[PDB]
């Protein structure tokens, strides 16, 4: 109530006179600022709106509730000299202009202005022009708290100050920081906005100390003795500077406190332990998740520098629209932005579903959405540039081959003539094949947008979920894109599309499994905007990332190590890659590095680490890692990093065993699957390289194209090879159902392997001795597949499969029970029999 009266008084002070309508409007505006903002649920806000209107009608009857009341009630002194009402459109335009200005002479990252941002900006403005104005921005982490607070403070000309978070933070340091802030604000008449986050409010002593200054605008028992005398000398100086005759100590301290009240503002940032005294001492403003419209506008703005144009894009009837204000008819760009919003909503829905199911689930924040859009932009640029340079290479080859057709015609005008005619027909066949290649390239131009959207969505959002959940999310996204008439290839090999042969083979040279999950994890490790947080209980991923950056002097450190901060300082200063394990015990000092906060002072590009400004090196990269799968991290840490998970599950393991069965028993079908994967981009790249070599050999012509007419074989070779890949395009579907049928045949064996391995790993509940590694089960599996003598001398695939199924249980039981008590042999046999009974059909 006191803050209500104070705000109304501040609004009514510089103004001359109003009707009752203006007083009612400002009263309602202050009521909304003090009560509606602290609300979370929107219908509660609607209830508050309706009841403010009801009370206004009741207490003040016979007053026009349309001239004095509107849905937008916005007050500011930005378009005037008094704190008067002002229309929303000019407010938005002015704030857009000031955002463009704030881009330049400050930290430069793209920002978007929507309705929520505008309201929050006006709220920070209001709290900054209220005496003893203190606000608590509560909401989801990584949504705009610090950015909006600093931006508004810069707009109002307040020197932004923040408390540096450093390992083993000392309370005396906090006291001296408060002393400096108070001296700069009260004495020097400097308007300072003070901002804190959960990374620093973790010590309740700081909060219980600052409650005194939040309530009274002063800290008793802080300025004593020599500090007291020095502050008094400077405060007398400031009082003379302003024009006061005040020279008594106690009244000078009182004037210092009043100046602190008028100038110093404190802003809090938190995520939904905290005393209610903090909640009540300052103003509360809810800062919930970005709305659907907000996400739509972010997608529309950040993709403006991208093509996403299809003039012949047919509008699909029954559009599964998620943004309730999509323009009719939806263009291609609007459709893509709608798809991105739907993707974010599907991540939220999947997290909710896993939360309901009891499984572990980790929060998704607008930072993930921004990362997704950034990855979309980078991948779109990459693929577009690559395909366009291939376009121009094919075109220049077409003119070169036409020039040589003319040259060989000139040579023919001079039995070798018949061979020259054969050369001519071969060249013409090459020419039409290249024209058809250009047509297929136009088709790829059509497909690239959807392909990029799906790949970027897979990279950015997915990465913490297992193989099955990743597949479900990708299926949902692809089904939505198909439902929105978006051109993407009906079959997508993310592993192939996001890499090629050479990175995969060098990863295989590294200590990296050939598992599809592992390949996707490596791809995520390659392309990343936020530093990865590798999750793996085994440790193959850490050794792999070591072997990858071995030449770059990669270093290992753990949060438990006391020298971790020192190694971090060295790596950051020098730019060597750093690997950090045990992120479960996390140190918030890493937050500025993950957030990529840098300042450019002169020739130096520094970063605030702890309490020291470390010079950032332009080659530094960090890899967070952990070994415990069951662990929860705060949503801030989730926002800061991208998650890469190596934990084996039943789906991943069954896919592994299915691949091994296909390799060992049906090498022809696994080879066919490999050819199907290579058909995506590997065969085309090899064919284009052979085309490059043919063009190069063709370039050295001095009449030697017809000397003995022997180079044309290479041409035929190329053409032959071309025909080969063409045939694999024809029977791609046939290979698909063939491999699908054989995988359906072999699937129950893989399910049995997954179930038996999980039974083995759960065996530890019985006795502490019963510990078995994944490598043990794979050893048993390889013994069953390769060095099993029962399979010798038989070729019927069904018979070999049945023999393998029997021997799997037999050998697994033998190997386990030899290292297992006699009392539990029957228990393990019963479990194995239950598994096989579930597996068998009939």
């Amino acid at each position: 109530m006191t803050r209500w009266v104070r705000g109304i008084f501040e609004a009514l002070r510089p103004l001359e006179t109003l009707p009752v309508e203006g007083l009612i409007r400002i009263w309602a505006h202050e009521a909304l600022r003090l009560f509606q903002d602290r609300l979370v649920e929107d219908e509660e806000r609607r209830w508050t709106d309706e009841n403010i209107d009801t009370v206004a009608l009741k207490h003040f009857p016979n007053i026009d509730r349309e001239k004095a009341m509107s849905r937008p009630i916005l007050y500011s002194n930005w378009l005037s000299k008094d704190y008067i009402p002002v229309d929303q459109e000019e407010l938005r335009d002015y704030v857009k202009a000031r955002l463009k200005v704030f881009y330049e002479e400050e930290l430069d990252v793209p920002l978007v202005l929507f309705n929520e941002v505008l309201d929050h900006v006006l709220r920070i403005d209001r709290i900054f022009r209220q005496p003893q104005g203190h606000l608590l921005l509560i909401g989801v982490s990584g949504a705009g708290k610090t950015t909006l607070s600093r931006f508004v403070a810069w707009m109002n000309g307040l020197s932004v100050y923040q408390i540096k978070v450093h390992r083993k933070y000392t309370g005396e340091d906090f006291d001296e920081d408060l002393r400096t802030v108070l001296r700069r604000s009260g004495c020097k008449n400097e308007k300072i906005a003070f901002i804190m986050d959960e990374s620093n409010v973790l010590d309740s002593g700081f909060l219980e100390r600052m409650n005194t200054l939040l309530a009274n605008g002063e800290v008793p028992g802080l300025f004593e003795g020599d500090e007291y005398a020095t502050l008094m000398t400077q405060c007398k100086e400031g009082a003379q500077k302003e024009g006061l005759m005040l020279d008594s100590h106690e009244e000078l301290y009182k004037w210092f406190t009043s100046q602190v009240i008028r100038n110093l503002h404190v802003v809090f940032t938190m995520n939904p332990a905290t005393s209610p005294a903090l909640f009540n001492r300052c103003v509360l403003n809810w800062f919930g998740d970005w709305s659907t419209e907000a996400l739509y506008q972010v997608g529309k703005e950040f993709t403006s520098k991208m093509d996403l144009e299809k003039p012949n894009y047919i509008v699909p009837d029954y559009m599964p629209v998620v943004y309730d204000k999509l323009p009719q008819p939806p263009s291609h760009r609007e459709a893509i932005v709608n798809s991105c919003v739907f993707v974010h909503q599907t991540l939220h829905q999947a997290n909710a579903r896993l939360a309901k199911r009891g499984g572990r689930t980790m929060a998704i924040t607008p930072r993930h959405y921004l990362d997704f859009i950034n990855h979309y932009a980078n991948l779109f640029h990459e693929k577009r540039s690559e395909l366009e340079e291939q376009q121009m290479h094919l075109n220049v080859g077409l003119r070169k081959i036409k020039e040589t057709v003319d040259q060989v015609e000139e040579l023919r005008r001079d039995a070798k003539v018949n061979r020259s005619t054969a050369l001519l027909k071969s060249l013409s066949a090459e020419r039409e094949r290249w024209e058809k290649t250009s047509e297929t390239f136009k088709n790829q131009m059509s497909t690239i947008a959807g392909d990029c959207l799906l790949s970027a969505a897979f990279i950015a959002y997915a990465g913490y979920f297992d193989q099955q959940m990743r597949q479900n999310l990708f299926t949902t996204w692809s089904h939505h894109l198909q439902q929105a008439n978006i051109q993407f290839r009906t079959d997508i090999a993310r592993t192939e599309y996001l890499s090629n042969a050479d990175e995969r083979l060098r990863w295989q040279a590294s200590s990296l499994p050939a598992d599809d999950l592992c390949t996707e994890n490596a791809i995520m490790l390659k392309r990343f905007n936020r530093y990865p947080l590798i999750i793996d209980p085994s440790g193959q991923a850490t050794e792999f990332i070591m072997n990858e950056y071995k030449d770059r002097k990669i270093t290992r450190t753990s949060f438990l190590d006391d020298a971790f901060r020192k190694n971090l300082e060295s790596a950051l200063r020098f730019g060597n890659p750093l690997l950090v394990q045990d992120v479960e015990s996390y140190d918030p000092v890493l937050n500025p590095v993950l957030n990529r906060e840098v300042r450019r002072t002169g020739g130096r590009v520094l970063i605030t680490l702890g309490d020291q400004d470390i010079d950032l090196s332009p080659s530094f990269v960090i890899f967070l890692s952990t070994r415990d799968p069951t662990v929860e991290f705060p949503p801030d840490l989730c926002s800061r990093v991208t998650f890469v998970n190596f934990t084996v599950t039943r789906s991943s393991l069954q896919s592994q065993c299915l691949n091994e069965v296909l390799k060992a028993e049906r090498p022809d079908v696994d080879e066919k699957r490999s050819d199907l994967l290579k058909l995506q981009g590997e065969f085309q790249l090899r064919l284009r390289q052979l085309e490059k070599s043919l063009l190069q050999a063709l370039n050295e012509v001095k009449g030697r194209i017809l000397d003995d007419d022997t180079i044309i074989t290479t041409l035929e070779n190329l053409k032959r090879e071309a025909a080969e890949v063409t045939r694999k395009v024809e029977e791609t579907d046939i290979v698909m159902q063939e491999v699908e049928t054989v995988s359906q045949q072999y699937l129950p064996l893989s399910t049995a392997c997954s179930s038996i391995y999980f039974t083995m790993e759960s065996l530890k509940q019985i006795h502490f001795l019963y510990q078995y590694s994944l490598q043990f089960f794979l050893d048993i599996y390889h013994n069953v597949l390769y060095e099993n003598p029962n399979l010798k001398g038989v070729t019927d695939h069904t018979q070999r499969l049945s023999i393998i199924t029997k021997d799997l249980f037999q050998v697994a039981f033998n190997r386990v029970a030899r290292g297992m008590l006699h009392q539990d042999h029957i228990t393990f046999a019963m479990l194995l029999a239950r598994i096989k009974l579930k597996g068998t059909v009939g």
Binding site: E104, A571, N576, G602, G603, D615, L616, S617, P618
Partner: protein
């Protein structure tokens, strides 16, 4: 007519470009530079329709667009990380002479920064790493030229040393950091300073390692 007017406006914009060029590179401020470039863009856009349809108008139009685009490169080139070595690397890799003491903004404006951005960015990152290492060694010099042993009395007979742990952590940190700098890709021209400093730190570490043992033994024997 219209052609005389557009030629006069072209002369005006040529004079403005010449005035911007003649300002030496050591005095041009990129903030004032972008202010003037924006002023020139508004000067071009404010022209009537007839003067907006000429080919020379288009020429100065995308010319100023390219200038505003390369303005960013102008900001990074204006830094303290390229004192003399990196500029000379730029000249030898760009094959155009640009002596800093005679350099003017016009000379940099002459060369195509659309095309030579790769060398610029590479030498920029190299210079950033170099100045990071240089600032670390400066911090080493400042901290070691002022550090002193905290001495406390003992039985009112002599002033012994208190604070062995902090000095040990300081020296070990400095040794580890210089050894890690030895692995940095920018550790080429700082080698002699690094060797001298690691020699000094090894001497300090060994000296104090034996000093603390001597101190403990002596106080034990005195007791």
């Amino acid at each position: 007519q219209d052609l005389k007017g557009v030629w006069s406006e072209l002369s005006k914009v040529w004079e403005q470009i010449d005035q911007m060029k003649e300002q030496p590179w050591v005095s041009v401020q990129p903030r004032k530079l972008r202010q003037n470039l924006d002023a020139l863009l508004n000067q071009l856009k404010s022209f009537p329709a007839r003067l907006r349809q000429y080919a020379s108008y288009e020429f100065v139009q995308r010319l100023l667009k390219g200038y505003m685009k390369i303005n960013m490169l102008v900001i990074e080139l204006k830094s303290e990380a390229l004192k003399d070595r990196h500029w000379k690397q730029l000249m030898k890799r760009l094959h155009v002479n640009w002596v800093v003491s005679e350099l003017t903004l016009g000379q940099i404006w002459d060369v195509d920064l659309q095309k030579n951005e790769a060398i610029v960015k590479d030498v920029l990152l190299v210079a950033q790493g170099e100045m990071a290492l240089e600032e670390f060694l400066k911090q080493i010099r400042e901290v070691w030229n002022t550090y002193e042993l905290d001495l406390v009395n003992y039985q009112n007979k002599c002033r012994l040393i208190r604070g062995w742990d902090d000095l040990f952590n300081k020296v070990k940190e400095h040794i580890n950091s210089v050894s890690a700098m030895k692995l940095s890709p920018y550790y080429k021209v700082f080698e002699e300073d690094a060797l001298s400093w690691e020699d000094k730190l090894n001497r300090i570490m060994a000296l104090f390692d034996v000093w603390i043992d001597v101190q403990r033994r002596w106080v034990y024997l005195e007791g």
